[PDB]
Amino acid sequence: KYPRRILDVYQILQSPIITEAAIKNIADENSLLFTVDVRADKKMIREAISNFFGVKVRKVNTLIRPDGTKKAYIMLNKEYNASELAKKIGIF
Amino acid sequence: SKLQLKLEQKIKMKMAKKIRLRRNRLMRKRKLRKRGAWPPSKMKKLKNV
Amino acid sequence: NNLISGQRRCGKGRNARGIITARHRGGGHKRLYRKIDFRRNEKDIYGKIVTIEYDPNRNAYICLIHYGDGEKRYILHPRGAIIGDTIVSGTEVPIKMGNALPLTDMPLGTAIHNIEITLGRGGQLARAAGAVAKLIAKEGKSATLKLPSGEVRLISKNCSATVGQVGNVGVNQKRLGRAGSKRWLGKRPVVRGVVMNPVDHPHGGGEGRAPIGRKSPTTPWGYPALGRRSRKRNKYSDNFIIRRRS
Amino acid sequence: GKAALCLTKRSRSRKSLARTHGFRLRMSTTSGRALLKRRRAKGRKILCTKTNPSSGKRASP
RNA sequence: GUGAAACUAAGUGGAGGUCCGAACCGACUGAUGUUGAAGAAUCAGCGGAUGAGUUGUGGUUAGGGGUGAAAUGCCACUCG
RNA sequence: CAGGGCCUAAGAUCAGGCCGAAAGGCGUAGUCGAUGGACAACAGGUGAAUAUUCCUGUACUACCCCUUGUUGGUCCCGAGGGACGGAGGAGGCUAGGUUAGCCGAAAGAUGGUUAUCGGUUCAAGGACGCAAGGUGACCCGGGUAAGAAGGGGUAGAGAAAAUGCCUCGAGCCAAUGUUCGAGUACCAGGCGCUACGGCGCUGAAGUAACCGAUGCCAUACUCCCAGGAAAAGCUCGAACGACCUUCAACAAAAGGGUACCUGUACCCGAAACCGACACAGGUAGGUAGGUAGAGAAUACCUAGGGGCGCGA
RNA sequence: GACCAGGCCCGGGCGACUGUUUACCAAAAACACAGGUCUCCGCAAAGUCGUAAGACCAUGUAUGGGGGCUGACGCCUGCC
RNA sequence: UUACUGUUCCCUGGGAUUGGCUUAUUCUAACCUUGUGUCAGGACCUACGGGCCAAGGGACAUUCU
Ligand SMILES: [Mg+2]
Ligand SMILES: [Mg+2]
Ligand SMILES: [Mg+2]
Ligand SMILES: [Mg+2]
Ligand SMILES: [Mg+2]
Ligand SMILES: [Mg+2]
Ligand SMILES: [Mg+2]
Ligand SMILES: [Mg+2]
Ligand SMILES: [Mg+2]
Ligand SMILES: [Mg+2]
Ligand SMILES: [Mg+2]
Ligand SMILES: [Mg+2]
Ligand SMILES: [Mg+2]
Ligand SMILES: [Mg+2]
Ligand SMILES: [Mg+2]
Ligand SMILES: [Mg+2]
Ligand SMILES: [Mg+2]
Ligand SMILES: [Mg+2]
Ligand SMILES: [Mg+2]
Ligand SMILES: [Mg+2]
Ligand SMILES: [Mg+2]
Ligand SMILES: [Mg+2]
Ligand SMILES: [Mg+2]
Ligand SMILES: [Mg+2]
Ligand SMILES: [Mg+2]
Ligand SMILES: [Mg+2]
Ligand SMILES: [Mg+2]
Ligand SMILES: [Mg+2]
Ligand SMILES: [Mg+2]
Ligand SMILES: [Mg+2]
Ligand SMILES: [Mg+2]
Ligand SMILES: [Mg+2]
Ligand SMILES: [Mg+2]
Ligand SMILES: [Mg+2]
Ligand SMILES: [Mg+2]
Ligand SMILES: [Mg+2]
Ligand SMILES: [Mg+2]
Ligand SMILES: [Mg+2]
Ligand SMILES: [Mg+2]
Ligand SMILES: [Mg+2]
Ligand SMILES: [Mg+2]
Ligand SMILES: [Mg+2]
Ligand SMILES: [Mg+2]
Ligand SMILES: [Mg+2]
Ligand SMILES: [Mg+2]
Ligand SMILES: [Mg+2]
Ligand SMILES: [Mg+2]
Ligand SMILES: [Mg+2]
Ligand SMILES: [Mg+2]
Ligand SMILES: [Mg+2]
């Protein structure tokens, strides 16, 4: 019942990434890029996106940068579309 | 009467024989993986070297 | 097989501090520890010999015992033993080799080994290869006997012991052909003090092959090396001694 | 095939060096607790040079 | 072969701090270098190379000390 | 995949306890501690910089749900097992290599010539199963009664185990191999485009023999003395004690669903580590081609990487 | 036929031999060595390290352990 | 080092720890040693140890002065 750690769930997602490679990844993989907290997990991020936008998450992959900042690859299920969700935010 | 024992004995050995070879196969994978030479995609590139 | 284990005191020669107390110990081949039964409890049951195994932790062989209750034990190997011989530990046991019993029920002039000095601690004396202790006499409370050193000690009567002589008597006959056989046992090279420097040993200095140059030979710690008896005066076991070895 | 005489630092792993010069090692003995007292009054930035975490980019494994 | 042994001829067997010789570990001679490419190396030969062998990783022994197949040698280019 | 969430050695700490001007020292269970044990994945493709990590295809492990059955279980505890040396050589296989065949292309201004050039490839895993290999009592091929692997039963402090007794059982052991995976996928070559990058179609044949491992069967066998870790996972099972419970727990097949933390860049027989240098040096381990050769020596070459950071 | 790839013989001294040693001027005739001898120790052992508790020796028991000298083997090892 | 002055290991005596009956020897109750003997908590201590009961020594020795 307990999570791994305890902190602000609304801080798990700071902001997305806007790069020519990231935008290229949305159309090919149906994925999304998000900078995340260092203390975050794949479970909290999976639960997070399920609540904000109301969409299913096929898989989550993460990594820690050299600067101590964690990044999160989020692949949505094929039923939904990351490009459609992208336009809802404002970024293409 | 005796066919029941002989018939069940072979099935009892086949399952153990089946699991025993699977055991020796995975340990062979764990062995050469520690050596660092298991993936054949990496070995065929280093066949002539 | 279950009596063998690898839990031993690694780091031979080194104490808790980690300094060398017993010198010239190190190297050597690895060896597991065998659990030998010296108390010889579980009395009044027969047990036969099946194997005659090699014990690296001693000079003598051992013998595996199989009792009717399924238990298994190790014991020393007597001299004329053969596979199939039985052994018993008790009081009214017949006086033959391999059996164990107190000294009260033994006759005079018996070949004895695996003697205990106190009840419960188990046998401590006459363990080595070809060892034997001859019972001279007994008188009331205690019983005197002879040891392999030739000394006549006075042991209590209620102490247990095993009959016969220890196996593999012919072990001194082989000479270690070379130095490598010595290092296999875990015995490092012995250096002579007369070659050292004066700071290391009292015999050190001097050009050429120096003589002793001292009133007597001395240990590395100053005391003499010959003649000085090291037995503690007024020891607790001083009355149990009949004479000195020779 | 012999290393020169001055090679006293053979690039040993940081895991072992932390077990010999790390923060937890100093706080065990009384001298190490006084060692840090000297380096704090000195005002040194890095109190223990030979230390690493159990995880992250610094982890030796 | 003998009364039985001792002894003795072949074959099998593949022992050894065995032999030659790379890696690996060592460093006997000479040259070169000697404000060196290098605070001990390069070049040409040399020794051991199944053993008392070599080596990694992780540890132990700390100075009126430790360690030393013992040179007063080594113990962070520092050791009477 | 590697490490942790599992185990333990060396060794370090140590509840209490013992000792001691202080600091503290010794020390029991216990806990930390990989250099070990245990535990589930491959091929191909994509490509400014990453992929056994992303995509495709085919698998595996754990947990949960579902469907029946069972209906006391789960720890503690007992036992088995894990569990191990060196040397030596023989045998059976494969990797790999060579040649041949097949397919395609080729005229490389010379005296002659195609004898030339290139390709001939594919894993983890699932299912089946093996000798003329090794092993297993009986004879000089046959016969025969015990006997192997692997099971069952029984007595005693006595569930399992151990010990003893009785009994069934000619077959067992595993690298390799067959088949699916495995598609006109991959591929030489050819047809067209160009900013010359590659793109887009097309895409034949895809076999055999010999040599043969330092690798696999293999802690297989033989010999020898120096006599060759531990714990957990796993498996079997009573009593005592503890916790929980009619499913809310154990157990079996299929199907379906779900899937923690850290490392992952780059150099690594080095210009990036260690040597104060972009230093003729040192740096564990893995992969091991062709000709000659006993050979991983040596000489010349392939893949691939280089022409040594002042020159004339 | 290249590269690669043992020079040998007679005699003597020391040490038996394989090995180890002064990292950076000494690899030896020095050290070690198997063996031999003397002496100590009967286990709560001697010895060794500690203020002490205690540890090693040893989970060993006089065919074993510690210490001194000598140093394969062969002939010997005298007198006070 | 058979230089001077000292320290330590070790040996010995007096005193404390330390007691009883006899003519120095014995006795057991202090003290020393041992137990895979036994009991013990939620459980274990066959993991040191603790309590109890035994065994061997015994007023010696260890320790302090
Ligand atoms: Mg990751
Ligand atoms: Mg090659
Ligand atoms: Mg000298
Ligand atoms: Mg002196
Ligand atoms: Mg002298
Ligand atoms: Mg002289
Ligand atoms: Mg090297
Ligand atoms: Mg040799
Ligand atoms: Mg050689
Ligand atoms: Mg050297
Ligand atoms: Mg050279
Ligand atoms: Mg050489
Ligand atoms: Mg030579
Ligand atoms: Mg030689
Ligand atoms: Mg220190
Ligand atoms: Mg000082
Ligand atoms: Mg130095
Ligand atoms: Mg893994
Ligand atoms: Mg405490
Ligand atoms: Mg402990
Ligand atoms: Mg643990
Ligand atoms: Mg590991
Ligand atoms: Mg894991
Ligand atoms: Mg790259
Ligand atoms: Mg076992
Ligand atoms: Mg032509
Ligand atoms: Mg039973
Ligand atoms: Mg990567
Ligand atoms: Mg990489
Ligand atoms: Mg390397
Ligand atoms: Mg280099
Ligand atoms: Mg330099
Ligand atoms: Mg070659
Ligand atoms: Mg070469
Ligand atoms: Mg060339
Ligand atoms: Mg140039
Ligand atoms: Mg340069
Ligand atoms: Mg240059
Ligand atoms: Mg030569
Ligand atoms: Mg002369
Ligand atoms: Mg010599
Ligand atoms: Mg030599
Ligand atoms: Mg020198
Ligand atoms: Mg030499
Ligand atoms: Mg020299
Ligand atoms: Mg020397
Ligand atoms: Mg003692
Ligand atoms: Mg000499
Ligand atoms: Mg008790
Ligand atoms: Mg107890």
- In 3D space, the residue among C107, C111, C114 whose CA is nearest the CA of residue C40 turns out to be C114
Is the C-alpha dihedral spanning C139, C143, C149, C151 positive or negative? negative
Q: Do residue A66 and residue D56 have CB atoms under 8 angstroms apart?
A: no
Q: What is the DSSP letter of C184?
A: H
- Rounded distance, CA C107 to CA C136, Å? 10
Total residue length of chain A: 92
Question: For residue D59, which residues of chain A lie inside 8 Å, CB to CB?
Answer: none
Resolution of this deposited model, Å? 3.0
Nucleotide closest in space to C203 (CA vs C1'):
G68
Best interface-test mutation with A: which of D55, D57, D58 has the largest number of A CBs within 10 A? D57
Cα four-point dihedral sign D26, D30, D36, D38? negative
- Using a CB–CB cut-off of 8 Å, the residues of A that contact D are 64, 66
Where do the domains of chain D lie?
A: 3-59
Size of interface A-D (CB pairs under 8 A): 3
C81: nearest Cα among C208, C6, C149, C166: C166
- Which tokens in the block code for residue C160? 């247990």
CA distances from D40 to D5, D29, D35, D52 (A): 36, 17, 9, 19
- Determine how many CB atoms are found less than 10 A away from the CB of residue C143: 22
* Residues C122, C75 contacting (CB under 8 angstroms): no
Facing residues of C12 across strands?
Answer: none
Q: How far is the CA of B48 from the C1' of F295 (A)?
A: 19
Q: Residue C204 and residue A89: Cα distance in Å, rounded?
A: 91
Experimental method: cryo-EM
CATH class of D3-59: mainly alpha
Answer yes or no: are the C-beta atoms of C6 and C32 closer than 8 Å.
yes
| DSSP string across B16-44 | HHHHHHHHHHHHHHHHHHHHT---HHHHG
Report residues 1-49 of B contacting strand F, contact meaning Cβ closer than 7 Å.
2, 5-6, 9-10, 12-14, 16-18, 20-30, 33-44, 46-49
Distance CA C81, CA C63 (A): 9
Task: Give the integer Cα–Cα distance in Å for C100 and C122.
Answer: 12
Which helix (H) or strand (E) segment holds residue A86: the answer is: helix A82-89
Cα dihedral C20, C25, C29, C32 sign: negative
Does residue C140 contact residue C127 with C-beta atoms inside 8 Å? no
Match 């247990």 to its residue by tokens.
C160
D-chain residue closest to A66, CA distance: D57
Task: Tell me the C-alpha to C-alpha distance, in Å, between residue A20 and each of A7, B43, C38, C92, C93.
Answer: 32, 36, 82, 99, 97
Measured distance CA(C44)–CA(C101) in Å, rounded: 11
Dist. CA C110–CA C39, nearest whole Å: 20
State the helix-helix crossing angle for A20-29 and A82-89, rounded to 10 degrees: 140
Which chain A residue has its CA at the smallest distance from D55's CA?
Answer: A64
**CB contact at 8 A, C63 and C34:** no
Alpha carbons D35 and C232: distance in angstroms, whole number: 48
Is there a contact between D56 and A64 if contact means CB atoms under 8 Å apart? yes
User: What's the Cα-to-Cα distance from C202 to each of A2, A70, C222, D11, D15, rounded to whole Å?
Assistant: 73, 70, 7, 43, 45
Distance C127 CA to G62 C1' (A): 10
Neighbours of C194 (CB within 10 A): 17
Token pair for residue A42? 């794949």
What is the distance between the alpha carbons of residues A5 and A12, in angstroms, rounded to a whole number? 12
**CB neighbour class for C76 (10 Å; exposed up to 12, middle 13-18, buried from 19):** buried
D56 vs A: CB within 8 A: yes
Amino acid, single-letter form, for residue C36: I
Ligand 18 center from residue A5 Cα (angstroms): 26
Type and span of the H or E element at A78: none
Contacts of D46 (CB under 8 A, 6+ apart): none
The pair of three-digit structure tokens given for residue A13, joined into one six-digit string: 């997602």
Question: Exposure of D23 by Cβ count < 10 A (0-12 exposed, 13-18 middle, 19+ buried)?
Answer: middle
Enter the tokens of residue A70: 């964690």
Longest dimension (CA), chain B: 63
Question: What token pair was written down for C230?
Answer: 């090291």
CA B23 – C1' F252 distance (Å)? Answer: 22
Beta strand pairing status for C47-49 and A31-36? unpaired
